[PDB]
Scaffold this motif. Sequence first.
Motif, short mmCIF file in Angstrom:
data_model
loop_
_atom_site.label_atom_id
_atom_site.label_comp_id
_atom_site.label_asym_id
_atom_site.label_seq_id
_atom_site.Cartn_x
_atom_site.Cartn_y
_atom_site.Cartn_z
N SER A 1 9.16 -1.88 9.54
CA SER A 1 10.17 -1.83 8.48
C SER A 1 9.53 -1.74 7.08
O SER A 1 10.19 -1.33 6.12
CB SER A 1 11.14 -3.00 8.58
OG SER A 1 10.44 -4.20 8.45
N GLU A 2 8.25 -2.07 6.97
CA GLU A 2 7.47 -1.78 5.76
C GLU A 2 7.02 -0.32 5.62
O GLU A 2 6.37 0.03 4.64
CB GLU A 2 6.25 -2.72 5.68
CG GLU A 2 6.64 -4.16 5.38
CD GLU A 2 5.45 -5.13 5.31
OE1 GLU A 2 4.30 -4.74 4.95
OE2 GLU A 2 5.71 -6.35 5.59
N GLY A 3 7.29 0.52 6.61
CA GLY A 3 7.01 1.97 6.51
C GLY A 3 5.78 2.58 7.19
O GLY A 3 5.46 3.76 6.99
N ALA A 4 5.10 1.79 8.01
CA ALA A 4 3.95 2.29 8.77
C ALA A 4 4.35 3.50 9.60
O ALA A 4 5.50 3.63 10.04
CB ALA A 4 3.39 1.23 9.65
N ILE B 1 0.85 -1.19 0.00
CA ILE B 1 0.00 0.00 0.00
C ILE B 1 0.88 1.23 0.00
O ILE B 1 0.62 2.18 -0.71
CB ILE B 1 -0.97 0.05 1.19
CG1 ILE B 1 -2.01 -1.06 1.04
CG2 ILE B 1 -1.60 1.41 1.23
CD1 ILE B 1 -2.74 -1.56 2.27
N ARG B 2 1.95 1.20 0.78
CA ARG B 2 2.84 2.35 0.86
C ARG B 2 3.38 2.75 -0.52
O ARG B 2 3.43 3.93 -0.84
CB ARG B 2 3.99 2.04 1.82
CG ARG B 2 4.95 3.21 2.05
CD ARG B 2 4.32 4.35 2.85
NE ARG B 2 3.64 5.32 2.00
CZ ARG B 2 2.71 6.16 2.43
NH1 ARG B 2 2.32 6.18 3.70
NH2 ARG B 2 2.15 7.00 1.57
N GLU B 3 3.78 1.77 -1.33
CA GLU B 3 4.46 2.02 -2.58
C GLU B 3 3.48 2.50 -3.61
O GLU B 3 3.80 3.40 -4.38
CB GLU B 3 5.15 0.77 -3.11
CG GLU B 3 6.20 1.04 -4.17
CD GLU B 3 6.89 -0.24 -4.70
OE1 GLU B 3 7.73 -0.81 -3.97
OE2 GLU B 3 6.62 -0.62 -5.87
N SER B 4 2.29 1.90 -3.60
CA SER B 4 1.18 2.31 -4.43
C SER B 4 0.81 3.76 -4.17
O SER B 4 0.68 4.56 -5.11
CB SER B 4 -0.05 1.44 -4.15
OG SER B 4 0.23 0.07 -4.40
N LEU B 5 0.64 4.09 -2.89
CA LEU B 5 0.37 5.45 -2.51
C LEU B 5 1.44 6.40 -3.06
O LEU B 5 1.12 7.43 -3.63
CB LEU B 5 0.28 5.59 -0.98
CG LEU B 5 -0.98 4.99 -0.35
CD1 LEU B 5 -0.91 5.05 1.17
CD2 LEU B 5 -2.24 5.69 -0.82
N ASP B 6 2.69 6.02 -2.91
CA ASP B 6 3.79 6.91 -3.24
C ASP B 6 3.94 7.08 -4.74
O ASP B 6 4.21 8.16 -5.22
CB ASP B 6 5.08 6.37 -2.63
CG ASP B 6 5.06 6.41 -1.12
OD1 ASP B 6 4.06 6.82 -0.49
OD2 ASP B 6 6.09 6.03 -0.54
N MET B 7 3.72 6.00 -5.48
CA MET B 7 3.73 6.11 -6.92
C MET B 7 2.58 6.97 -7.43
O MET B 7 2.69 7.54 -8.51
CB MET B 7 3.66 4.73 -7.57
CG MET B 7 4.95 3.97 -7.54
SD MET B 7 4.76 2.33 -8.29
CE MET B 7 3.27 1.70 -7.51
N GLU B 8 1.48 7.06 -6.68
CA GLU B 8 0.38 7.90 -7.16
C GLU B 8 0.48 9.34 -6.68
O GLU B 8 -0.38 10.14 -7.02
CB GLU B 8 -1.01 7.32 -6.83
CG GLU B 8 -1.36 6.06 -7.63
CD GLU B 8 -1.56 6.26 -9.15
OE1 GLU B 8 -1.55 7.42 -9.64
OE2 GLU B 8 -1.72 5.22 -9.85
N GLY B 9 1.55 9.67 -5.96
CA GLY B 9 1.75 11.04 -5.48
C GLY B 9 1.19 11.30 -4.08
O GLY B 9 1.17 12.44 -3.62
N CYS B 10 0.76 10.24 -3.41
CA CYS B 10 0.11 10.36 -2.12
C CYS B 10 1.08 9.94 -1.03
O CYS B 10 0.73 9.13 -0.17
CB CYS B 10 -1.16 9.49 -2.07
SG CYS B 10 -2.35 9.76 -3.41
N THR B 11 2.28 10.53 -1.05
CA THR B 11 3.32 10.25 -0.05
C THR B 11 3.01 10.84 1.33
O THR B 11 3.60 10.44 2.33
CB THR B 11 4.68 10.78 -0.52
OG1 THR B 11 4.62 12.19 -0.74
CG2 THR B 11 5.14 10.06 -1.81
N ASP B 12 2.07 11.78 1.35
CA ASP B 12 1.59 12.50 2.53
C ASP B 12 0.62 11.67 3.33
O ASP B 12 0.49 11.85 4.52
CB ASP B 12 0.75 13.73 2.07
CG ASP B 12 1.23 15.02 2.66
OD1 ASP B 12 2.23 15.02 3.41
OD2 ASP B 12 0.61 16.06 2.36
N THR B 13 -0.14 10.83 2.63
CA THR B 13 -1.15 10.01 3.23
C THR B 13 -0.49 8.99 4.15
O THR B 13 0.40 8.25 3.73
CB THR B 13 -1.96 9.28 2.15
OG1 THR B 13 -2.56 10.24 1.27
CG2 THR B 13 -3.06 8.44 2.77
N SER B 14 -0.95 8.95 5.39
CA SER B 14 -0.41 8.07 6.42
C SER B 14 -1.02 6.68 6.41
O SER B 14 -2.08 6.45 5.82
CB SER B 14 -0.62 8.67 7.79
OG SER B 14 -0.02 9.95 7.88
#
Lengths: 352, 352, 352, 352, 352
Positions: C254-257, C189-202
């Motif tokens: 370590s997955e970024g939560a 989910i983290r990587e998907s979010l980040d690839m879509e520009g949603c790096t802010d979303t927790s």
Amino acid sequence: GPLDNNNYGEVWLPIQARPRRNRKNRAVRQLVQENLVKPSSLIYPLFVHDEETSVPIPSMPGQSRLSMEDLLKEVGEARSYGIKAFMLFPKVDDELKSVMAEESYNPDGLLPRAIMALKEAFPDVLLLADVALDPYSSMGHDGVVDEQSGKIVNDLTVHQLCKQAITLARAGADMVCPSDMMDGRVSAIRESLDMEGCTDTSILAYSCKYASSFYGPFRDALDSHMVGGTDKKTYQMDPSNSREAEREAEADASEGADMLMVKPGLPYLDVLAKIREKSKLPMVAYHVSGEYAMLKAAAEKGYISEKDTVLEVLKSFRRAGADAVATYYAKEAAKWMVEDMKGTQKFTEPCY
Amino acid sequence: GPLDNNNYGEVWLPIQARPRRNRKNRAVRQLVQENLVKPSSLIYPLFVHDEETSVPIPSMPGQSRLSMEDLLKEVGEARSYGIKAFMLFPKVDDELKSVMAEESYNPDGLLPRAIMALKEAFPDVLLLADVALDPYSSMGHDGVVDEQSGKIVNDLTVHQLCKQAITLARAGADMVCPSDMMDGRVSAIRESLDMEGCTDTSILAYSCKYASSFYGPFRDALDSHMVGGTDKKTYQMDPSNSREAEREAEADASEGADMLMVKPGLPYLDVLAKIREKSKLPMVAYHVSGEYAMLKAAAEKGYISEKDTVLEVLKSFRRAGADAVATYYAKEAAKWMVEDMKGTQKFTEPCY
Amino acid sequence: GPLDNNNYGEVWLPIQARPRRNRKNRAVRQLVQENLVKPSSLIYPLFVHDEETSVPIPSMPGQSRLSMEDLLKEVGEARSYGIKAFMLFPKVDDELKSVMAEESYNPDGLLPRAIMALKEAFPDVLLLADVALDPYSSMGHDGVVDEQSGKIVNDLTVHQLCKQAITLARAGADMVCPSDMMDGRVSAIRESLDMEGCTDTSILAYSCKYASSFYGPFRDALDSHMVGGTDKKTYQMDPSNSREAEREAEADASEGADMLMVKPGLPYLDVLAKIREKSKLPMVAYHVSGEYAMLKAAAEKGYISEKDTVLEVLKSFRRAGADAVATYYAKEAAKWMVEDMKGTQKFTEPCY
Amino acid sequence: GPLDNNNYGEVWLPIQARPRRNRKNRAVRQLVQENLVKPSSLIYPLFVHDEETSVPIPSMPGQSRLSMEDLLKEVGEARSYGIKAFMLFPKVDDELKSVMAEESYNPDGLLPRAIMALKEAFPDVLLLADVALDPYSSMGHDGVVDEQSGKIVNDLTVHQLCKQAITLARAGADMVCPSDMMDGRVSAIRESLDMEGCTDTSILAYSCKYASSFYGPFRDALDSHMVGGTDKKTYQMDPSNSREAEREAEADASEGADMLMVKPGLPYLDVLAKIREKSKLPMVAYHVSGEYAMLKAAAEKGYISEKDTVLEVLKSFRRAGADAVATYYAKEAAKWMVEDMKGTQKFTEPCY
Amino acid sequence: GPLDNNNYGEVWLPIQARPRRNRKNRAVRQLVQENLVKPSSLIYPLFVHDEETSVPIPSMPGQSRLSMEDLLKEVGEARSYGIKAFMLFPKVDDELKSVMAEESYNPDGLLPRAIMALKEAFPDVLLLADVALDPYSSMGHDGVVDEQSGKIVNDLTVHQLCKQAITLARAGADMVCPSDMMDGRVSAIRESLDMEGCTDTSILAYSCKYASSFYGPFRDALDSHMVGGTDKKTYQMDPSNSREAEREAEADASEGADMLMVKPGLPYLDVLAKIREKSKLPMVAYHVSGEYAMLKAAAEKGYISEKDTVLEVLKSFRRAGADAVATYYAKEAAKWMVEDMKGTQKFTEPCY
Ligand SMILES: NCc1[nH]cc(CCC(=O)O)c1CC(=O)O
Ligand SMILES: NCc1[nH]cc(CCC(=O)O)c1CC(=O)O
Ligand SMILES: NCc1[nH]cc(CCC(=O)O)c1CC(=O)O
Ligand SMILES: NCc1[nH]cc(CCC(=O)O)c1CC(=O)O
Ligand SMILES: NCc1[nH]cc(CCC(=O)O)c1CC(=O)O
Ligand SMILES: [Cl-]
Ligand SMILES: [Cl-]
Ligand SMILES: [Cl-]
Ligand SMILES: [Cl-]
Ligand SMILES: [Cl-]
Ligand SMILES: [Cl-]
Ligand SMILES: [Cl-]
Ligand SMILES: [Cl-]
Ligand SMILES: [Cl-]
Ligand SMILES: [Cl-]
Ligand SMILES: [Mg+2]
Ligand SMILES: [Mg+2]
Ligand SMILES: [Mg+2]
Ligand SMILES: [Mg+2]
Ligand SMILES: [Mg+2]
């Protein structure tokens, strides 16, 4: 001196804390009992061969090389006592053994057939298959031996173990159990299993497996003794070493393993405890063939009471930190438990 | 992106460690199950009064103030399902209560009589007697209240608690349980017991006992609510504090306690766990009357399933570190376990 | 005996340390109080449905299936008392549910519209949206159920949850909260979010979520009970286990939560404390529907006092190590706190 | 290099963990905020003298040597803002100072009369009284000075400090606070109190008190500077040492102290956190006169914003592990909090 | 009572351990002294502007915006007292400040020019240069502000920071000091520097830099205050938090940082110690401008002795675990040691 008298003239040691109070009677001991053994915590290892009739293993008294038919009857008997987890080892026909051990990934080999047949007959039951070449090796070694050097070649051995693991996985093995001690094999097997769609299939890593002399009888069972005076000390661990076990355990958890095994059992309970303290994975202990013979042989001669000592051993494994124990006493212990639970309950009660 | 494809084209997330594999089916869950509940790990707390007939406690639905003969009946029924440990609380006639709480050390009083009665009838029962003045106090406080100041006077209370303890020990209580949270009472009680020859009598110390509002229903059952708007915050612990509990635990172990109690229960499982980590003594938790009333209330309304939640609660106490749990559900939980074990064995099996 | 007399002849136990001194009165208790609860540490979970009118949830008394309009009213009342964080669950029409649960990533579906509507009405509101297929699943499972095996298939489920998380992020959700317990979903989910520009979303990761029986009233609220007598034990955790909690927590870290959630609440304070001790991430605990029902049930019958017990419960989550607590009592707690501070200040004071 | 582009051509750094997400807006920061300040965690230290009028202490801008009647007005003002604990120091008439420092245990002395007057005007007030000889010493030293050697004689000093503590206790001091740094005085004082029936009186052990140059302004306030260019380095601690603080803190805890003080404040946060980690007692830090003067000096010159910096300071003490903080800003902090809480609520909210 | 009498009848407290014995005199205190300060552990941060004449910073008394000429005289005078490390900050002409802050990476800018001219003038000098956008930002923020959202956009900011560090590294900076608190920037700057062949250039990571109100006077020095009532709380850390610090420190270590900085100084010594304890990198603390101003202010007004207090502060930094301390007192402190060393040696001695 240290002794006083109490209000009534009786001798009195004025110590405040008395640990014996928590041993006063069974009810109190039970209140504070820290560890419990149950049947579904025991793994029952069995031997199958591709023959019509069962044959005793004389050095493992009471255990046999079972025919397919007696294998099914044995699994069924063990389930009736609450054993759920079974380990399967094949005594391969000698004509099939080779230096490369290609029979280990033959999908029509004895082991896959047995797994397929046990699963048809008992679909809810749990099957652990060993991954290692020694049952299939003409040299008696868990991996490929190099013609020129005599070394057990690590990486070539892993290539093979992967093929075996997939075959067993496909036959229906719930859990594959690499007992080979090659470097890196958990991760390799894991990745292959996963590439083939078998992400469900578990790996019970033999992490801390020592180069023991307590495996004698298992090698009789399988007719799998090392050729020509050779040993396994270049892959199985030096019993002089504990620190090294942490090295191996840490590597297996991070390579993806589901459970870690410590083997042999009672003489390595310190290692079991140490890894248990440090690992976040379930731990399994293996009460090996030599350890079983020791019990039976002393029991047969009347030196010890078989039932009391076996139950004490299993409690010890469990206290030392084993979540599960592979033991050839698995069936007999469960039977004792169920018989007490049905009789006078001298030592058992329900749990969940 | 993070998703790949496997050898057959299916969607494949290339993670190595898959904790779900250790949840795959019941057989595997059982192999790796870390904690177990058994009946002999439950303590059943009961109320006796000096009346001819038992009376329900409306705020503890299913529990009663028991007449002496129904107390015997109830201990018998709990024994038959495997409960071995029983806590006893007296509902004392309001005529006998006072400031100093004299009835507490009356050897002809209700509680001593009940202990003797249960000992005649079930000699191997474990009987835990509460030590504290609030069942006998006219102010409803666990210690002696000063006339001029209103303070619960620590050392004069401890004098009294010694007098009560000896009385119960002599009656046949296997264990006295000081629930008073006065300072230093474990050491003082221990020495008085030992001076009288009662060195065998155990102390279950209420070490980490919080000034909770989950005790109301118990107070209904004993008619023991605090007089005149006052509270127990000067002796029971602030629920805001955890570090303080280690202070109480350490002192009670060195004062010679045999077991340590944390109470209330579920809302303090963190203190239970902290003290389990630190202590070398067996740990007991109390699932208190308010906590019982909550389960029961929601069960009667149909909001939760009673059996599932109670059994989860008991597994939780045990995971958190309770060697033993005092719970008003003890009888009923053992009854369920015993029924399953005699039936389909849907969720139990034997242990030892 | 241990009791001595002071200089004025009064009974004296000569112990040096006395923990009761730090309990003497409110002022000293306040000086040494280790934990504090504030409204902005509470998360308020609400239910919305696509109907004109709000409908009470009978097994969660006081809580309702809210209409969109009433959702805005309710968030607004909670904001006014200091609650800043709100978690939103959709009751979906039976007709939109399916095995693949594709309504979960429908950008015109109820939850995304609820988020957009709440954001338009309170632009600085903190919104946490669940990620999991069960509200949309015709099977009542958090993942996709395979037709042939009945397994909840992991990786294909993660792909769906990635789509769901993107839709909610895009709608305005501040945090996505994956409650699914699929392996590896956090990182995916983290990587998907980040690839879509949603790096802010927790990501509020439910790391240690147990296969509990206290979720029943929630499942009444969403009408999302599992079909066919199935359960979630192949993915939610066995309540018997604590060590496993550390395996899960370390991996989500370590997955970024950004935060780790333990659920359920009071019965898991041991797991909460242990993960608090070892994690460097903020901790959240969930006081779940079943826990809510118990309190209400009891309060309604008058067995306990609602206010006292709710306020102690919240203090307990906090002592145990919760930075934030998700609770259906969030609004009510904040209100009590705000009324006390505006009134006579019997138990509250300012903080920062 | 390390930068990639997301799905929309925007610069993207593919890190999984972003700690900034937990800083995104006030609401998130509040969810995860580890430490809170409240007024009832502040101790307000005050100066009284035996004169008609109050007199500013010029090196502590805004504090004064209070007359008795103004002492009362000041305690009253600080209570209305929620301060509950007050530290009291006497500026003793110079004609009453001496080498033996016998005025320290005069029951008709200024400090005892100050306690009795406050305890009569504000019965629920918490009073902390310093135990040390320097306010009464004509040489300005914390203990008895030997005529021939110039050494501060430890045990003789402890004898006098016991006398002083009993006097302050009898006058109504809730806590005595030995600030002398003689060896063994916590135990001596405790035992002396207990023998006199003052088992309630608390001891706030100055355990880690450093030989600081930050006490200047306080010494102006009491006119208690050392004679003859001498120092206190043979009793107060060398600021170079941290290990030593553990030795000090362990002794005082086992001698019976109720709380442990570290002093001075901010320049000893490392020590404060260390003893917080290793101690089970409540911790207090002293934000001393010199530190107060530095904040006031810089604010008066406009170099810093007084309010912002003071508030960050108290948060730092509280983050570093102080349960309570002695600070000459105590009243002013409570006021800022109450004013905010009654006004814009820009930085405060209710707690319990 | 507690005291007894020795063989001459003198008052004697029979305590065995006496901590004052290790404080008996300077010789003893020196033997046991745990920590030392030396000039080469101090970092002297200076300001340069592109004007012909140096200009006092009124809010950091004694510090100036130095001309290039005067910058070289100041580094020479400080190198003459044993300071070897200097930090360089530029006040930028307000005409060159932008939203994107492109002047930061101008190889002909003030800072690169200071660097080159200081290396030419003293090749053996260690120069530390700041990396951050705020001296160059028209918004006064350490990163690029999105015109549309007002968010300091992390990744786009890191792109810029990499360009600046490359620039300063080519100019001759031995160490770049990213003070920006963007996520991931240590790794990104490291890889950038490396690809340019600047493998030798060090990174002192501002790991734990808090959103403090002690930065005021520095922001005066550079005229860099945040515009329009904004703050840095979305990137600089909340002073309420310590656990978060561990998380930043762990990440920066693993991204290649050479040293780790805690900032601000005294009011964060707890964070400094904890990070010291966990990390294997050298630690640096920053005694920031506001802290300096407070010392100067109180000193000017005669409230404290400047010399004693400063020296105490620096010793504290070192006890707390600072290997090096950035402080504006670096020259003045070094000058004090040299003068004592060359003089009468009241408090210094040689070391190596
Ligand atoms: N790799 C094969 C294997 N798997 C289990 C055992 C021994 C079990 C027992 O003795 O019961 C061995 C033998 C060995 O490696 O030498
Ligand atoms: N000291 C007596 C005692 N023992 C157990 C409880 C409460 C038990 C229950 O709620 O089940 C109490 C009452 C109290 O301390 O107020
Ligand atoms: N993923 C679904 C979800 N999210 C939160 C809850 C339960 C919350 C509560 O009971 O209040 C559940 C139900 C479940 O997973 O079984
Ligand atoms: N022992 C007396 C005492 N108690 C408190 C302080 C100082 C407090 C302050 O500086 O604000 C001192 C002075 C000293 O010991 O030198
Ligand atoms: N990143 C810029 C920077 N580098 C050092 C300081 C402060 C130094 C001082 O106060 O002495 C600051 C200011 C800020 O971050 O706002
Ligand atoms: Cl069965
Ligand atoms: Cl046995
Ligand atoms: Cl799986
Ligand atoms: Cl169950
Ligand atoms: Cl961000
Ligand atoms: Cl409260
Ligand atoms: Cl108030
Ligand atoms: Cl603030
Ligand atoms: Cl001495
Ligand atoms: Cl010095
Ligand atoms: Mg290995
Ligand atoms: Mg106690
Ligand atoms: Mg997980
Ligand atoms: Mg001392
Ligand atoms: Mg960082």
